[PDB]
Design a protein around this ligand. Structure first.
Ligand SMILES: [Ca+2]
Ligand SMILES: [Ca+2]
Ligand SMILES: [Ca+2]
Ligand SMILES: [Ca+2]
Ligand SMILES: [Ca+2]
Ligand SMILES: [Ca+2]
Lengths: 523, 520
């Protein structure tokens, strides 16, 4: 009944109930939950709940641009375009025109690789902190290129460079967008950085790309030829970074400044993109909201959710926990105590959580007074960065099981697990997962949960690879988390074996294998 | 409720303390401290107490652009941006070819503490240091890194009459409480007074906005090289043989940004943000000649604020006067508990950190300290034209809950209550501390400060690049003492501090701060 800002939704509805249907607003009474209606929250002193250029009525009723992802319909999630720059194939040639000695290798681009290259796990996690801290944090704008089809051969042999001259560097690139917003006049600037030595900056301009970049869409639309860097000239190199590229180091490719417009619906007809720009609302959006990155093993996402400053009594904004922020940002079906993706069971004990130092200190300070000892029941504060890594393989001895092979000596007729059922242990437990299902020259982490209701009934684990190891683990009365690294080798090697021997009392649950980063191959 | 200046705040509420809740202004009742509210005071003749474009109510109610810091919420602190430039790498080639590449570290406040002079024993209640040359956070100084004694011309076969070329890596930062929309720097480059070449950059080549605390090369990214410049695309900065021989000696490259320009954000009826008609040109001249400057330097970050103050000899202005401590608490996000100020966890006080004034205001502080009876420098009034710098120690102990040293002090007992603040040490025997060079920066200048009392002789011994032993007789009260030393490179020995007393003496608040960088 009371209106304050320039929105049709009243003051009494802008807290504790938000339903919008047939372009009018009605409250929430938990009765139309499964008819496609949801409940939101917003402020009451500002027209825009975030820094986006849409009002809270204009973004929670569908009366805005149709190209925006539907997860940004919630007023606590801001539309934000993030353009990243990807590499596919590296071509080196020794001519300045476009014959000569040329080599060409096939690479894969990794998005969240420099973020999690400074993560080292412990054998046991003290207190209830079930997450690790990274040395540095980077968003999904930079990429690291890993060469796969590379036998033992130097780059200098294929070019025959003696003292002072060198060859030229050409590449194949693509232009991805991972966020809940499109751009229209896309003009990105990107450094091609080799460990601090900026070789060149590529600017795509306008006519080489087109007048659109839809969210979740590259410029080569799925199955198409990649964009080579010839259509605005070649990139040179010298004979001091060739052995630097040869021995251990990899080419980083990072965008720095990205310019573009946005579309607003006019009075009469379709959208316009002339008098708008995504360069002014970026500073407004980034100074109020947090930053959550989700890394599914086939695609990546990154969102900004507005938070609450707890050292302010005047500030009236909604406050969220970590799990509610994840559910509102990425979209998650709420199963019985669980958060679900389309097929991925994200939770606090089924993924890997990465924070930087300030976020880790804030969470470790806040977890002392919590009465439930879980990460997801932590209040959100403005200015933290969270990374979620979905493991490649994960089983919980339940309806979800996607390991390439099957285990041995597994009994599932029990119910005293962390999430429902568990695995009774009697003797040995073996798994021989082959190298053909594993990416070569990487680093992997095997993580799991253990529980034994006895005094000193321990277990031994053993990981067999090129760098094999054996470990001894003692459990406790409660559920304890263990993590162990191993490193892989090229595709012409043996299988990866994981063995563990118990003593007939211990219980295990939530066994997962995830990837961390790439190791340098000796060349 | 009579209103002389139109800002929808009554003059009776504006003269005393007042606060804002539920988007209305109410008086101060001295009971909102535990809830989280704060008190404000503003002039009643002018709608804008400071020279900022925002009015009193808009600044004091948080209705401005949300990109500024929340420490500019009070109307007595201006909100204007102070951008700066730092330099992180050096590449020299003789090509218009050999190439030499080295790494450098930048310091924001290094010309501020270049000319300070330390002394043993402070013969007043002043307990502070006086500098000769004052430089803000806009100026910055760069220092070279590990070269193993190699000459800078042994890789470049250049004789007299030829010119080498400078290629550098530049990182742009902000240290204020305002975003800098449409930034355009016009920075310089000086070596022993000689401007080699100015450096000019435009809006649409670096980040168009600079939010206040962010960086144009983002954290985890790479610095912006000057080879990726429009005007530095075919020529570089020339260098003669005399200039490179000066750099080979004890000299360093400093960078000072002279003048910047751009707009600021506002609010619109139809849209939200426009940054065209506004400008940060005619407002900086109002801010810089009406207020006083405070600089804080914590071990990872520096801040610079400007706080408006009452003029002395002119009754005609009614700006609210402040003490030094209240202005320090208002300028930064400082929380006061038990009579002590804490910024976030690092303490700031008159006896805990090293505070430096310039030469013009130290006489004013010393003359105002004679009339005061508390004999503390955090109680003197603030006038127009004071310059304060605060340096927090890297290592500091008070024999209490706060400790930062990487090695435990030997022979320490804190079961007393007769100290200056909290518990204190008793030197029944002698205290010793070893500290390794891996925990310290190489080729720097450090000072070590503390407080001693004897209700006897105290012999101090510092092992450094020059070992120094000295004697000090303490008085019945408390006197601040300090001793300077210098360090050596990374692969040298450790650093020893030994303090031997007489049995009936007390020590408190032992700190080590960094001042300068010695030339190699
Ligand atoms: Ca409303
Ligand atoms: Ca509203
Ligand atoms: Ca289970
Ligand atoms: Ca006023
Ligand atoms: Ca007024
Ligand atoms: Ca003390």
């Amino acid at each position: 009944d009371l209106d304050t800002d320039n929105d049709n939704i009243p003051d009494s509805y802008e807290r504790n109930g938000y339903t919008i249907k047939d372009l009018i607003a009605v409250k929430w009474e938990d009765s139309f939950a499964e008819q496609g209606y949801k409940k939101y929250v917003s402020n009451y002193l500002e027209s825009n709940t975030a820094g986006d250029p849409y009002t809270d009525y204009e973004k929670a009723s569908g009366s805005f641009d149709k190209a925006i992802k539907t997860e940004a319909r919630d007023p606590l999630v801001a539309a934000y375009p993030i353009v990243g720059v990807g590499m596919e194939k590296l071509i080196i040639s020794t001519n300045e025109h476009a014959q000569g000695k040329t080599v060409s290798r096939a690479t894969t681009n990794s998005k969240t690789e420099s973020n999690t290259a400074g993560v080292s796990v412990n054998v046991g996690y003290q207190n209830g902190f079930t997450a690790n801290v990274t040395t540095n944090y980077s968003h999904t704008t930079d990429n690291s290129t890993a060469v796969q089809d590379s036998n033992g051969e130097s780059w200098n042999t294929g070019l025959s460079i003696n003292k002072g001259e060198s060859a030229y560097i050409n590449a194949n690139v693509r232009y991805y967008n991972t966020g809940t917003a499109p751009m229209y006049k896309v003009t990105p600037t990107t450094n091609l950085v080799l460990d601090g030595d900026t070789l060149s900056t590529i600017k795509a301009q306008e006519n080489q790309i087109g007048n659109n970049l839809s969210p979740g869409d590259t410029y080569p639309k799925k199955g198409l030829s990649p964009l080579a860097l010839n259509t605005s000239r070649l990139i040179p190199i010298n004979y001091d970074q060739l052995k630097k590229l040869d021995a251990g180091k990899q080419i980083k490719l990072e965008t720095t400044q990205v310019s573009g417009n946005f579309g607003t619906k006019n009075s009469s007809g379709q959208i316009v993109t002339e008098g708008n720009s995504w360069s002014d609302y970026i500073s407004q959006i980034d100074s109020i909201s947090a930053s959550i990155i989700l890394d599914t093993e086939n695609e990546s996402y990154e969102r900004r959710v507005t938070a609450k400053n707890l050292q302010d009594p005047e500030d009236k904004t909604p406050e969220l926990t970590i799990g509610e922020a994840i559910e509102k940002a990425f979209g998650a079906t709420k199963k019985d105590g669980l958060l679900y993706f389309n097929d991925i069971p994200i939770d606090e004990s089924c993924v890997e959580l990465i924070f930087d130092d300030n976020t880790a200190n804030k969470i470790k300070d806040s977890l002392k007074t919590l009465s439930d000892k879980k990460i997801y029941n932590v209040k959100l504060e403005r200015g933290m960065n969270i990374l979620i890594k979905t493991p490649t393989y994960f089983t919980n001895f339940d309806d979800y099981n996607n390991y390439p092979s099957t285990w041995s000596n597994v009994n599932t007729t029990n119910q005293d697990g962390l999430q429902g059922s568990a695995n009774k242990l009697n003797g040995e437990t073996k798994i021989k997962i082959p190298m053909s299902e594993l990416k070569p020259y990487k680093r992997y982490v095997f993580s799991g949960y253990s529980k034994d209701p006895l005094t000193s009934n321990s277990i031994i684990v053993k990981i067999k690879a090129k760098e094999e190891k054996t470990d001894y683990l003692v459990p406790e009365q409660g559920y304890t988390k263990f993590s162990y690294e191993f490193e892989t080798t090229e595709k012409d090697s043996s299988n990866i074996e994981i063995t563990l021997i118990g003593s007939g009392t211990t219980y295990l649950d939530n066994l997962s294998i995830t990837e961390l980063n790439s190791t340098p191959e000796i060349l």
